[PDB]
Amino acid sequence: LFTVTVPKELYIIEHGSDVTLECNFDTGSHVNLGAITASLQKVEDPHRERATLLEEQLPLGKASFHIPQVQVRDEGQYQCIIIYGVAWDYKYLTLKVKA
């Protein structure tokens, strides 16, 4: 089965700093993708929406999403969603913003 894992589920970031949220995916064959979609979807959210995929790290088996200069509005739960062909999986990530 195509699966997604999150080795770190909680990110605690200082207000106005950047963060890179991540989840990994596991497949038993060379990673054939441009067949891979990944998205990070905020649960509460409304869109210019902010976390951008870093495609260059996909061959490392990671879906990494960068948010610059995090704001109060970035705080909350996110689904890390990875699609591979018609197969898919997801995990939850939480971002907490300290002052």
Q: Work out whether 83 is an interface residue with another protein (CB under 8 A).
A: yes
- Site for another protein, residues 29 to 58, rule: CB under 8 A: 37, 39, 41, 47
- Cα–Cα distance for residue pair 24/94, rounded to 1 Å: 15
- Cα–Cα distance for residue pair 68/16, rounded to 1 Å: 8
- For another protein (CB under 8 A), the number of binding residues is 20
State the pairing for strand pair 52-53/62-67.
antiparallel
Q: Work out whether 26 is an interface residue with another protein (CB under 8 A).
A: no
Please measure the distance between the N-terminal and C-terminal CA atoms of the chain and give it in whole angstroms. 41
Q: Work out whether 6 is an interface residue with another protein (CB under 8 A).
A: yes
**Contacts to another protein by CB under 8 A:** 1-4, 6, 9, 37, 39, 41, 47, 79, 81, 83, 86-92
